[PDB]
Each structure stands twice: as structure tokens, then as C-alpha cells.
Symmetry: D2
Subunit: 318 residues, 4 copies
């Protein structure tokens, strides 16, 4: 039977017999993603170039913010684009806290590289007046998370307790079609992904691990290398093909570069629901308790055999 | 004034006072590229999954049929076809087209950027058309370019008048001129290659990449990017500057990329943009091919970066 | 605040504290409507004409499959099917849907506006659904409406809460709420019927039309419009006011339009918008059908106009 | 073999050995029609209604056609339904052609989503004097090309030239007009008549009798059907496809009709004649009227030749 994102979420909600707020939230986010996809693919660019005589990251943030505010399902919104948490006005408050990066990778969008939207959804835990503190939950508390990848096609990957499911946007009809059900990552991959241009700054553990991938001590084939430079594209390839993605700490950047709340945690959650792993080196990404909504974290994620091998090398230098 | 691909090509053809065959060819290829973009973005995928109860093959069929029906071509070389295609006599025109209809599609399962690459020659011999008419050096190209199906769809077209970039507006199905007479940066800050083959690299490549990560002059190290899809990696090189490398390795002792419909079209765009493209021993555009699917090593990009690599290459004889 | 069809229906369903079946039904229909619109605007026609080397049947297949797979329906009545379709047991829900998947398609050769019409009932039986579950008067309708594939695509949905109009934004494939709680004008200035059959008219219809062209009180004559596509003519009546007629005559004592999936949904829309819909003898919604494909005369639109017609009909006993 | 509008126009142009100006004109107009279609179908309307937290369609359509024609370098004088005076193209952008157009015909009722359309007629400038409004005052017989785009259930472009009438369907998935009906001809006699019968009190007596003959034929044959969309492009395209007759005739209140000669009547009369139909004012061929004002009106009766001839017989009976 054909299935769509909306119909899929509704069916899961009916099984759980929830109130419907989470379904309204996801439907609103789905509408925002279709509008971002349309803008990213440059619909209407002819009018900007004068056929008849707002930047993408700003527009993307406005779409997600406005669709989430008007869903009546959220109370606190944390965005990569905003210094402070946004508190939904009282008449529109619902029960969820949403952390998101509305257009990840957009710094290099001038070269038409894949870009994406990342989101993580938490339940507000206290009855206190909503505030920035409500977003300071460990990733283990996520109720749902995922990403939209605007690549050669647009796909939404949605992770929940029931697993990870992948939906392809059919732009002819504006519907997300379920195309990959209950996806699991390979136990061990053949690709490693990181910015090797910064090798002079590498932690000694990262240097040794990468050397073993290129010069295996036994007779296995060296791994292939890929680094798009857009987190959503690199993580999605890691999910589909297996392997390992690294944005690790070094001494210049002792906490890494990627943001914990709206980059690392949603991707770590997708990975764990697909049977993968996600570590800071010292602990699971999902176990870090944040103290700042924009705090950074190191991240190494992907196939479990590859992540465990990195942790072996990391321990060796600890 | 706004400009479109069709109107741009027509105006250039009128200036040159040609017969119109090349304009008909390019218009036909433009139509194929829009149809490929629609399929790559998965229009109609709901019907395949039962709402009412392969991509590289379709892409090849689109380009082949639109080029045959243009009446402008006589010999067609495709990555997808083992032999050159000889256009039937009643549809024959004067141009030879070499193309890769969906480059990078081996990894399309992860939604990586993919693209279409093409190079167009005037048939040079007066012999009956045959595979030999496609064996010209890239220096003989009349036009070349690529369509990138990335976050948006863009067509990059290089001719004697330079390199011009057109964005497909999917609301109206028109390629809009957005970047005119493009030139590559003299020196970039990104290097692009699959370092997974480090064990197989020749010493010149090894030393060069070492210089990018550990500069002797205490300058900042280069960043690394490698999409694994040639059109995406080359387009970033064009837009941002830098260097792209696919050297020979043990699996690929003559290189991996195809000379006729990957290396030559990209080298032509690079040189018309003021960049460089070398095999290490000679300019890519100067290689005389003997086989339509033959491979070549390639290093291309900003001139100062390619010149620095050639300096290291000279050092190792 | 912006609103969409899906979010609007979900909010109304949550207010009503229903089980969710009707919302799933409407979402599935909305997907079918978007797929029908795409085909009607001829997306992909280049492939039918050979770029790489039925419509009413497809429309019926889209509606049937999306409704079957919604798990919300048990009996489906379509203009396209001689007998009611009984949903297989594991996919059964509690609702009966009567629909015309592509009304007006006989003249789609001239690109006239076409549409989809639907009416939704709760089933009457407590087990063993059958065609009898579709033989309900229109008064039993829970929801009804139509999609108009006109210059743009619009979905009009009528429920107890009133009538709401949603424009399909094809750039994002979303139905946007653009007209809330619509009410028809009390009196219009347009009448709509096929005057080519004037020879067969009931004397009452003859007199009423004469009053529109030669008003007795020196008011302005009405304008005439007749698209010949019921959804287009009824939507114009809703938006502008006025009156639409497909009346009974001696050759066709029960009219031409079908009661279950043309007259009843349009009459329900009209009544929820403050209009009227009559057969001449009784309200359309009060007719108890005995056959799923039975015909009915229909006169609908602005209340002052329908009441003026009924006054003339009364005079002719 | 598949054919597109661009490939069709180029091929006809190559045969004629022209300079390419008309092809550039038609391609620019084709781009304009695609952008009008996108706007008419409401692409982007979600932004107007606040999805992220601006100009009327007839104004936008005029701006699109005007800007694309000016930038084609193929035109010198432009007449639009929307502008009181002819637009004279600035000297560095001038070409040899005169274009008359209605950028969005029928938009008065676009609130109810009725079919709308774009109508155009193309003339060669005839005099060697500085271009002016007078260059647009040519009879329709001087037309080089004319046609219309119908934004109906699908978008179709009908293009008439010396070689006949050809119909192209816009495939919105790829933004290309695909040739779907070649060298179209209208039926010799139809079964549908089309006019606003609500104004019957004001009819000319000849029109009253003709419509009387359609509903109550003297030989007891079957009556004609009636259709009137109220959008000229929709009603005329139906007349072309199904045959029959379309009337917007003169009366005493409107002795010159209501439709505009230069950018409604003449282009449609030209399409009809190239398809083997007829188009008359009652007194003369529409294409033979020599205009004196760019916005002058003309009565028009057009369609299947046998139906128009029967109208003319009734019209002659009433002198
Ligand atoms: C960790 O959560 C994952 C699972 C969940 S729970 C929710 S929900 O939004 O909280 N509840 C919800 O949609 N309920 C719903 C919707 C409709 Br329509 C009908 C009925 N019927 C009834 N209640 O009898 N119920 C969504 C998802 C995906
Ligand atoms: C290496 O070439 C780069 C430049 C060229 S040359 C050609 S072409 O196809 O050979 N000639 C061509 O389009 N002619 C053309 C087209 C049109 Br419309 C009108 C007229 N007018 C006339 N002939 O008076 N001529 C295309 C391009 C881009
Ligand atoms: C004349 O129509 C009356 C209006 C109605 S009633 C229905 S419905 O489908 O029967 N019920 C329904 O959607 N319930 C729903 C949906 C979601 Br999400 C969450 C919850 N929560 C919970 N149950 O706690 N409930 C749809 C419409 C438009
Ligand atoms: C009024 O119907 C007459 C038919 C006509 S004439 C024109 S045109 O624009 O005047 N000439 C034109 O397109 N020439 C053209 C274009 C291209 Br490409 C190549 C060559 N070749 C060459 N010149 O050798 N020529 C268009 C149409 C449809």
C-alpha cells in the first residue's frame, strides 16, 4: 500500500492514542520543508533577474518559525539563526520544545552543494513558565528527530521510537512518499568522512585512526574518503552506505565545532534508532547535559564497528 | 536585461551568422537537461509506489533522442553505450557529441549531486561517419559544459565567447542567465581528491597534498572537500577556486575519469574560465585519443594551484 | 495565521474529539486531488509524445486507491463504476463516499475546466457493508465538496462548521486556506443553463428565463453563462451569486445530473453557504434514492433567485 | 518524432531563410506565456497568505509580455489592452515587428477560476518613418503571425502562420510546449452556438432570428447546444476544436461591438481563417477592417463556415 508522511504519522499517533499535537507539529514542519525545498531549487529566480522588468537562510528560518508557532504545538523554539530561545506567545503554546537548523550547509550554497534542515523535538518537562532552560535536555529525551536533505532529490528522514523511515518528496504533487521503511545502518562501512585539510591540528588519536583507514595493518582494502562539507549530506550518505563521519575535538577546539542541540543530537538520535552509534569520544552524544543552547560538541558517528574502532584508538591516547 | 539560454545562444549564433544547426543542437540538449532534472528530482515517483493502485538509462534515452531528432548530429558517444552511435542518414547533421548523461549516478542512492557533461565537435573528416569522428583532441571543441543537479539545477556553457552560467527556474522551466563571462580565482583554498588512495599515490601527489596540509610558509592550510561526483567537485572549483585531482592509482593505472566526455569538457570549461587542466605530462585538451572510453588522470582548477602542482611534478622528473 | 487543508481538518477533528477516520479520509482524498490536478495540467505529456524515444480512468483509479488505503471507507460509489465497490474487509472503515472523479471530462478536448465532486456519509449497517449504505438522502451528509481544476486548482469543502475554500499552491503542493466560512450572495445577476434545449423546457422554466431577459420591474437583465462543466458553473454561482439550472422536462422527467455524486454534494455546499437547491418539487437533499446512478433535476444558487424560480414553478401547478 | 515550439519555429524560420528576428520574438513571447501560466495557476500563493510570516495578475502579465518583447530586440511598437498609447521601443532595442496583444484576456472573472488567456498579433512595420502608433493601424490581412495561449484545464498555445495552425501543450514538469495537433482545421458545420443570451432584449433582429433558428429549427432537426464561458479565448478555442459559431455582435447600443479589433478580433479571425473557418463583422471580413484607433471595437461572428454563412443569410434578410 502506498503511504505518505502525513498518513504514516497519523497512523502512528492513532496507535499511541495521543492527543494529536505531535502530529500537528510534524505536519506543520512538513509544510515548511516543502516551502524550503521550493526556494532552494530556485523557483521564481526569473523574477529576481528581471523577467517582468530575502536570503535563503533567513527565509528558511522564517518558514520553520512561522509554521511551528502557528501549529499550536510548541512553546519554545531554539534555532541556529537566533541568539536566544524564542518563546511562543501564550495563545499559541503547545507542549513541545523544538531545536532546529533551518538550512544547514548554506554557507557553501553558492556552489549548489547539498543543503538540509535538521530538527529535534522534546516534550517540555515542567509546568514552569516556558524559558530557555526548557531546551537544555539531553538528546536521550528526544521524542522525534530527523532531517530534510535537499540533494539531487528532496528526502525527509524521520526517527521516532518506532525506528527510522525515509520519505521522498514527489514535487509533481507535493507529497512525501514513504520509500524506505525501518532503515538500519550497516554494521561496518568502507567510507570515512572528515575535513583532512586541518590535519596539522588533529588530535593524535584522530591522526592514527585516519592512518589505519588509509594504510590498514592487514590485507583489507583501504577505506574510500568522502567529505561534502554539508553535515546533512555526509550523515545521510553514512546512513545509506555505512561508514564513519567525524567532526572531532582538537586542542584549538576542545569541544568540537558542531552545535549540540540542533546538529549533533538529532543526528545522534537518527543514528541510534538505525542501530548506529554517536560519541563525543568521552561519552555518547545523547548523554551530554547541555548548559547553553548554542554549546558545541565533538561528534563521531556511523556504523557501530567503525565507531567502536575509533573509540579503541581514542582510548589508546587517553 | 534578463536573458535566457535559448535567447543567449540565438544571439551568439546570429552574431556568427551561422546556419543554425548548433543552435538547434543546444536547444535540443537544453530540453533533455530539463527532462533529466525533472526525473532526478523524482517527479512522478508516487505513481511508481502505487498511488493509483532506471534513471541513467532514461537520461541516456532523453539525450540520444533529442540529439538525433535535432538533425544536427552524425556521431554520438555516450558513457552508457559501448559503441559510438551513428545517426541514421536522413537525420544527419555536422556535429559530433560526446556526453555522460548522468555522471555520479552510481552513488545516487544517497541523493548526492549528479550531473550531465557534454562536449560538441564539428565533424572533421569527410569520411562516412564513424567512431573515428569522435577521436578528436579537446582543443577542437566547439562548445562544452555541464548541468549540475545539485541543491538547484544549473547549466554551465563554455564557448569561444567564455563561460556562462544559467539557473533553471522550475516554476517556468527556463534557464536564466545568472553569471556572465565567469573567471576562476587565480588561487584557491580548497583541494579536492579521494585521499583513500593515499597508499597508491605517486610521490608528486603525496608531496603536493602534504604542502596543502603543512604549508612551508606558515600560511593557512587548505580545506578539503570531495563530494565523489565530478560535476559537483568541478563546479565548486569553478565557483570557489582551488584544485581538483583524480590521479592514476593501482586500480586505475591510466586514471579513472573518461577523457572524451568527462575530462575534455571539464578542461575546456576550466581553460575558458582562465583555469588550467593537466594530466601531469601535458594539457588534457592536447591528448589525442585512440579509444572512445579511454581514461585519463586529471588535475584542474585555479592556475596558481595547478602551476604549483606542476612544479612539484617536475621535481620528481 | 496561515492555514492549510490538512491542519484545518485536524484542528476541527480534534475539537470534535472524533476517532480520526474522517481526517484520514480527507487527507487521502486531498492527495488524490493533487495527483489528479497534476495529470489534468498534463505533467509528463512530453513522454507520451516521445521525448525519450484515459484521464477519467486514471482519476477514478487515484480516488479509489487512496480511499481504499485510507482504512476509513467501506463502500465507494463512482460515476465510473456500474455497481458500488465494497472495500475488502481488512481495509474497511465506517464511511461511504460517492464521487465523480473527473466531472466534465467528455469535453476536456477543448481544455474546459473540469473537477472532482465528493460526498461522504456514515454507513447505516452495523456489519456487511453493501450498496444499500449508499442509498441515503443528502441530508445525511457529513462532509462534501469539490475540486475545480480551472485557471488554478481550488478545493471547496463543506461541513457543519460551514464552507471553506483552499487554493492549491503547486510550488509546494499544499492547499492554502484563502476563503473562510463562505456565504453566497442573497441575490445574483447571472443565470446558467443550456438554452439550446429551449424547445423541451417546462413552461415554468420558460417563464423564469423570460423574466431574466425581460425583467418586469425594469431592473437590469441578468447575464448568461454556461460553461457546460458542472463544477465550473456551480463554483461561479457560489463566488458571484446567481442561479444554475439543469431542470426536468418531458423527455427527461428526472433530469440529467446524477443525484448521489453530482446533485447532493453541490446542494450540501450550497445550503452550508446559505444558498438553496431544489428539484422543483422538493429540496435536493430530501430525495431518498433507490438507485446509485439515478438522476435528479436541480436548480441551485442564491436564495432570492431560487425562491423566485419556485414561485413561478408554483404558478404552473 | 517529438516536436517543441522552439524547434518548430526555428525549423520554419530556417526554411524561409529569415534573419531570426521573428524566431527571437516568438521565443520571448513563449517565455512570457510560461511565466503567466505559472502565476495564473497560483505558484507561490502560500507566501501571500503568510507562510513565512503582491501585484495583480493582469498588471503582472502586461509587465511580463512587455519586458520580454522589449528585450527581444525584434519589436519597435507595442500595443496592449492595458495601455492607452502604443509603446515605442527605445532605439537601441528596436526590431522590425509590431505586436498587439491582450496579456490576460478574461481576467475580469478570474475570481471564479474561469479559463483565461493571452492573445497576440504580429505585424511587420510597413513604413520607413520613425516608428509610431500609426504602424499598428494595419488591417488583420497584414498579420505575419497570431495566436493565443489558453490557461484552461491545461495550458495550450495555438500559433497561426502562413503554414497553418498548430497547437502546443505546455508540459509544466519541464517547461516545454509540445506539438500535439498539427495543421488544425475547423469542422465545416458545428452543433454549438455561443453568445450572451442574457442581453436578448438588446439583440439586433437578425441575431434574434438566427438564435431562434438554432433552438427551433424550421425542419424539425435537432436543436444546437449552447455554451458561453464568457472568456473569449475559451469560447473561441472550443469553437476551433468542436466547430460551431461564436458571436459577439453589434446592436444599437453598441453599433461597433464590444471586443477590440487589434488584439482580440484580428488575431482570432486570423487563426480561424488559417484553420479554414470564417470571421465577419456582419458587413465585412474582420481582417479587412482598416483601423483608425488602436483600441477601436469591432463586432465579430466566427467559426464553422456553414454556420457563419447561415448567420449571414439571416443578416441579409434583415438588410
Ligand atoms: C513518540 O510518539 C510517537 C507516536 C505518535 S503520538 C502522536 S500524537 O500526536 O500525540 N497523537 C495523535 O496523533 N493521535 C491521533 C490522531 C488521529 Br488523526 C486520530 C487519533 N485517534 C484517537 N486518539 O482515538 N489519535 C503522533 C505520533 C507519531
Ligand atoms: C562556435 O559557435 C559559437 C557561436 C554560434 S554559431 C551558431 S549556429 O547555429 O551556427 N548559427 C546560428 O545559430 N545562426 C542564426 C540563428 C538565428 Br535564431 C538567426 C540567424 N540569422 C541569420 N543567419 O541571418 N542565424 C550558434 C552559436 C552559439
Ligand atoms: C463534520 O465533521 C466534524 C469535524 C471532524 S470530526 C473528524 S474525526 O476524523 O472524526 N476525528 C479526528 O480527526 N480526531 C482527532 C485527530 C487528531 Br490529529 C487528534 C485527535 N485527538 C484525540 N482524539 O484525542 N483527534 C474530522 C473532522 C473534520
Ligand atoms: C512568418 O512565417 C515565416 C516563417 C518564419 S521566418 C522566421 S525568421 O525569424 O525571420 N528567420 C529565422 O528564424 N531564421 C533562422 C533561424 C535559425 Br535557428 C537558423 C537560420 N538559418 C539561416 N538563416 O541560414 N535561420 C521565423 C519563422 C517561423
Amino acid at each position: 500500500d502506498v503511504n505518505t508522511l502525513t498518513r504514516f504519522v497519523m497512523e502512528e499517533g492513532r496507535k499511541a492514542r495521543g492527543t494529536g499535537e505531535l502530529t500537528q507539529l510534524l505536519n506543520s514542519l512538513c509544510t515548511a520543508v516543502k516551502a524550503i525545498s521550493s526556494a532552494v531549487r530556485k523557483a521564481g529566480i526569473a523574477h529576481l533577474y528581471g523577467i517582468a522588468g530575502k536570503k535563503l537562510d533567513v527565509l528558511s528560518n522564517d518558514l520553520v518559525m512561522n509554521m511551528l508557532k502557528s501549529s499550536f504545538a510548541t512553546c519554545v523554539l531554539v534555532s541556529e539563526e537566533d541568539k536566544h530561545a524564542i518563546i511562543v506567545e501564550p495563545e499559541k503554546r503547545g507542549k513541545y520544545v523544538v531545536c532546529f537548523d533551518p538550512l544547514d550547509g548554506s554557507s557553501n550554497i553558492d556552489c549548489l552543494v547539498s543543503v538540509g534542515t535538521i530538527f529535534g523535538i522534546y516534550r517540555k518537562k515542567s509546568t514552569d513558565e516556558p524559558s530557555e532552560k526548557d531546551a537544555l535536555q539531553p538528546g536521550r529525551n528526544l521524542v522525534a528527530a530527523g532531517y530534510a536533505l535537499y540533494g539531487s532529490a528532496t528526502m525527509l528522514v524521520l526517527a521516532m521510537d518506532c525506528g527510522v523511515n525515509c520519505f521522498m518528496l514527489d514535487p509533481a504533487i507535493g507529497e512525501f512518499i514513504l520509500v524506505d521503511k525501518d532503515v538500519k545502518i550497516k554494521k561496518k562501512g568502507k567510507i570515512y568522512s572528515l575535513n583532512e585539510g586541518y590535519a596539522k591540528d588533529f588530535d593524535p588519536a584522530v591522526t592514527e585512526y585516519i592512518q589505519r583507514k588509509k594504510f590498514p595493518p592487514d590485507n583489507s582494502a583501504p577505506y574510500g574518503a568522502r567529505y561534502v562539507g554539508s553535515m546533512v549530506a555526509d550523515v545521510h550518505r553514512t546512513l545509506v552506505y555505512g561508514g564513519i563521519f567525524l567532526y572531532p575535538a582538537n586542542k584549538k577546539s576542545p569541544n568540537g565545532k558542531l552545535r549540540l542541540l540542533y546538529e549533533c543530537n538529532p543526528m545522534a538520535y537518527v543514528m541510534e534508532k538505525a542501530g548506529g552509534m554517536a560519541t563525543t569520544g568521552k561519552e555518547a552524544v545523547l548523554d551530554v547535559i547541555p548548559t547553553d543552547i548554542h554549546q558545541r560538541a565533538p561528534v563521531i558517528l556511523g556504523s557501530p564497528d567503525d565507531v567502536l574502532e575509533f573509540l579503541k584508538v581514542y582510548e589508546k591516547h587517553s
